[PDB]
Design a protein around this motif. Structure first.
Motif: not given
Ligand SMILES: CC(/C=C/C=C(C)/C=C/C=C(C)/C=C/[C@H](CCC(C)(C)O)C(C)(C)O)=C\C=C\C=C(C)\C=C\C=C(C)\C=C\C=C(C)\C=C\[C@H](CCC(C)(C)O)C(C)(C)O
Ligand SMILES: CC(/C=C/C=C(C)/C=C/C=C(C)/C=C/[C@H](CCC(C)(C)O)C(C)(C)O)=C\C=C\C=C(C)\C=C\C=C(C)\C=C\C=C(C)\C=C\[C@H](CCC(C)(C)O)C(C)(C)O
Ligand SMILES: CC(/C=C/C=C(C)/C=C/C=C(C)/C=C/[C@H](CCC(C)(C)O)C(C)(C)O)=C\C=C\C=C(C)\C=C\C=C(C)\C=C\C=C(C)\C=C\[C@H](CCC(C)(C)O)C(C)(C)O
Ligand SMILES: CC(C)CCC[C@@H](C)CCC[C@@H](C)CCC[C@@H](C)CCOC[C@@H](CO)OCC[C@H](C)CCC[C@H](C)CCC[C@H](C)CCCC(C)C
Ligand SMILES: CC(C)CCC[C@@H](C)CCC[C@@H](C)CCC[C@@H](C)CCOC[C@@H](CO)OCC[C@H](C)CCC[C@H](C)CCC[C@H](C)CCCC(C)C
Ligand SMILES: CC(C)CCC[C@@H](C)CCC[C@@H](C)CCC[C@@H](C)CCOC[C@@H](CO)OCC[C@H](C)CCC[C@H](C)CCC[C@H](C)CCCC(C)C
Ligand SMILES: CC(C)=CCC/C(C)=C/CC/C(C)=C/CC/C=C(\C)CC/C=C(\C)CCC=C(C)C
Ligand SMILES: *C/C=C(C)/C=C/C=C(C)/C=C/C1=C(C)CCCC1(C)C
Ligand SMILES: *C/C=C(C)/C=C/C=C(C)/C=C/C1=C(C)CCCC1(C)C
Ligand SMILES: *C/C=C(C)/C=C/C=C(C)/C=C/C1=C(C)CCCC1(C)C
Lengths: 234, 234, 234
Positions: A7, A25, A29, A52, A55-56, A58-59, A62-63, A66, A68, A132-133
């Motif tokens: 990117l 993905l 499918f 699921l 599927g979860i 996948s998201a 993808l996040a 990109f 985020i 995150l610490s």
């Protein structure tokens, strides 16, 4: 790091994240396609849970791809880590669903399922807090806290679930034993990769670490799901 | 404030947060130890729910201790509050579990349980929004909104649950009545402490407020759990 | 934009958000009042689910009104969008509850319900990620991902649920068909408004967009709930 900056945003690991998204993905499918005309009540429950999972994922992938789903964490030392926090959002839903698959195969009781899900969710949330610490004392204390929860998870799997599964047919037992062995081996890799990778000691760079999570995830989700959903054991 | 700055980061309240973490962890492990060889189906359900209460609180306390569980909120006035937001993450899971314990003792119906959990979760989320809000109009409107939800919670407890509990044995009734009285008294303290403490009027300083939440939490979780899990009423 | 800056903070859309909050609160309290002495087990389940729909929306609307429920997102272009992210927090709980109402009317199986809820939650979370995304490629990819999930939701509603509902009485069927038609029409408006509004192409300004969501929400929650809760079909 190792990879290719797809990117043009300075992250060579997006090569592995983009491959990860695609593989999740396709797995999603393929399970949907396979499950499409299934009528058996029990079988459709395994299909619903299992579709699921990638599927979860996948998201989440993808996040991460990109951008985020990554955040900068500035440590007490001044080192800025790039923490892919979206992984924990993914695991918080997918790890309970994978355990639910195993619990349904074993036909364990509802209290055991609630116990597993709660302890596993605690593992994931404390792992996220650790990632995150800001101080090394806090990061390693959390890894320890989460690792203890993981040990309770493995414990209930290899005692309560396995003893319930013993009561089922050889074909159910065979599938349960194979998937439980896949879980015990693959899931153990996660806290190890975390502690040697950017989250921890930094001996493995982010590029290699991202490829390594992508392999573990795809195997743990699409591999596990393929072995489960192809099985007579439903 | 009142306390001792354990981590040298300028927060004397960490004394009470570190004590809180320790007391929650000891409570957790004592309930696990006590529950270890319990076979009765009903009893193990109370043990599973109740262990997770101080277990979840252990993690919230430790996050508060280390510091990730506190955030600065700059008010319209320019006053910067230190808001321990991790409390709301804790209560969102632990308050429904404590109510679930009471609902199982009373053997109320599933609709009542769903109603209780939903209204209680609404109370906690609106309390969190209020704690993070920048204007005094918004902070007090939220406290009011959350307080109304709390009143519905108390209402269903002292009507629906109590009338269901009336149908059980004297020993079940005795335990239910004691724990419901502990809830009605202790939980009422929370919105009071919030409105007089740093979240609200600021008449109680953060150090004393943190000690006060630590006492209420330990009593509400480990105290409540000890009274419940020691009971014949399972 | 279109509206009136109620809080003097430069947001004319707060007129519609304040009206929205009021209408959700009145709807909530009207359903509570209507449900108050209802004894039928089945009816009280519909009342419990349905009251929580505008109750949760009340809180989201109030957060948006006060301002905590809006965030600035700076796009790759340099355009700063004002994203009302609290909508997604609302929909993540209310859309599953509305579907649960339809699933109870149809008396579909538990696997179908779990499937619906999971896919619908995925729709909402991916919609939130899209709304917060910085690049146009990412924002439109998410809208597409979420839109595909929405299509699975509509699909299960108009096949699985409708065929289960066919087995019930004419009066149950009539109510189910009316509410399913209201869902198919109203919910389809959401991804359309998103893509033409500030989240997307920006052809509809924020003021008009906020009024448009307020109308859709009130109709989808209080309208839908009024038609459901007034029905003999319980
Ligand atoms: C967002 C996206 C797509 C997401 C789609 C999902 C998650 C689909 C889930 C479908 C399931 C789980 C099917 C359950 C069925 C069960 C039948 C039933 C009882 C539900 O009627 C069956 C046929 C056995 O798998 C892509 C980008
Ligand atoms: C992270 C951490 C540890 C967390 C551990 C947890 C939360 C353990 C939970 C165990 C439970 C709830 C036990 C349920 C059992 C029930 C038996 C069963 C049916 C489950 O087999 C039993 C024996 C009755 O309590 C420490 C730091
Ligand atoms: C925060 C706020 C108020 C929130 C209040 C809520 C959400 C009330 C919910 C009540 C419900 C859902 C009632 C369920 C009953 C069912 C009877 C039962 C079985 C529960 O006993 C009934 C009478 C049929 O509706 C305002 C600002
Ligand atoms: C999102 C929730 C409703 C779902 C529950 C998630 C929960 C289990 C995990 C907690 C999330 C937590 C780790 C976030 C903390 C990160 C924090 C340091 C701040 C960084 O965040 C930055 C902003 C944008 O500038 O994004 C802010 C980003 C947002 C906080 C949310 C985005 C999170 C991930 C990108 C989501 C990917 C996972 C899947 C889409 C999950 C959906 C499954 C569904 C069926 C529930
Ligand atoms: C974490 C979730 C997956 C679990 C659900 C939590 C949810 C119910 C509560 C909402 C959290 C919300 C209050 C956070 C909003 C704070 C906000 C003002 C920003 C401050 O956050 C700052 C960043 C680091 O710089 O941390 C960002 C921090 C992260 C947002 C998360 C850390 C939250 C607490 C420290 C967690 C402690 C509670 C227990 C560990 C809960 C686990 C129980 C389990 C069984 C689910
Ligand atoms: C709050 C949670 C415990 C409940 C789950 C919510 C979840 C499903 C949705 C994910 C929230 C996510 C969109 C937040 C990401 C926003 C992010 C870009 C950062 C902006 O946030 C800024 C800070 C204040 O400066 O507020 C930080 C604000 C906080 C992150 C939380 C405030 C969110 C909304 C204002 C809440 C309104 C909705 C209802 C009150 C929901 C309650 C229903 C209940 C029964 C669960
Ligand atoms: C960036 C910002 C500052 C932080 C983001 C805020 C995030 C952390 C909010 C996410 C909170 C989220 C994880 C809430 C959890 C929700 C989980 C559930 C609703 C699962 C519960 C489902 C039960 C209700 C099902 C019960 C099943 C029955 C049938 C037995
Ligand atoms: C699909 C994803 C899977 C199966 C992920 C599994 C992840 C874990 C078992 C994570 C475990 C961790 C610890 C034990 C300690 C802290 C680091 C964690 C989250 C990685
Ligand atoms: C273990 C923790 C317990 C039992 C916490 C209970 C907390 C509450 C009952 C909180 C109530 C509040 C209000 C009624 C108004 C706003 C402030 C809240 C969250 C503190
Ligand atoms: C009470 C609120 C209701 C019924 C809201 C419904 C919202 C949706 C169906 C949202 C759908 C969306 C997409 C299909 C794509 C991305 C934008 C979303 C969230 C708006």
């Amino acid at each position: 790091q190792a990879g290719f900056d797809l990117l043009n945003d300075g992250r060579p690991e997006t090569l592995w994240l983009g491959i990860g998204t695609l593989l999740m993905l396709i797995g999603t499918f393929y399970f949907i396609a396979r499950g499409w005309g299934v009528t058996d009540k029990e079988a459709r429950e395994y299909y619903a849970i299992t579709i699921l999972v990638p599927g979860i994922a996948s998201a989440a992938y993808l996040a991460m791809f990109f951008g985020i789903g990554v955040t900068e964490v500035e440590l007490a030392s001044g080192t800025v880590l790039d923490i892919y926090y979206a992984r924990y959002a993914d695991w918080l839903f997918t790890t309970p669903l994978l355990l639910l698959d195993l619990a349904l195969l074993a036909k364990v009781d509802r209290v055991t399922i609630g116990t597993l899900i709660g302890v596993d969710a605690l593992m994931i949330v404390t792992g996220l807090i650790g990632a995150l610490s800001k101080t090394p004392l806090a990061r390693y204390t959390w890894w320890l806290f989460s690792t203890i929860a993981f040990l309770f998870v493995l414990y209930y799997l290899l005692t309560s679930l396995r003893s319930a599964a013993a009561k089922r047919s050889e074909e159910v037992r065979s599938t349960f034993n194979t998937l439980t062995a896949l879980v015990a081996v693959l899931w153990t890799a996660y806290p190890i990769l975390w502690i040697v990778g950017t989250e921890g000691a930094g001996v493995v760079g982010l590029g290699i670490e991202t490829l390594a999570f992508m392999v573990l995830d795809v195997t743990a989700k699409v591999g596990f799901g393929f072995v489960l959903l192809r099985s007579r054991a439903i």
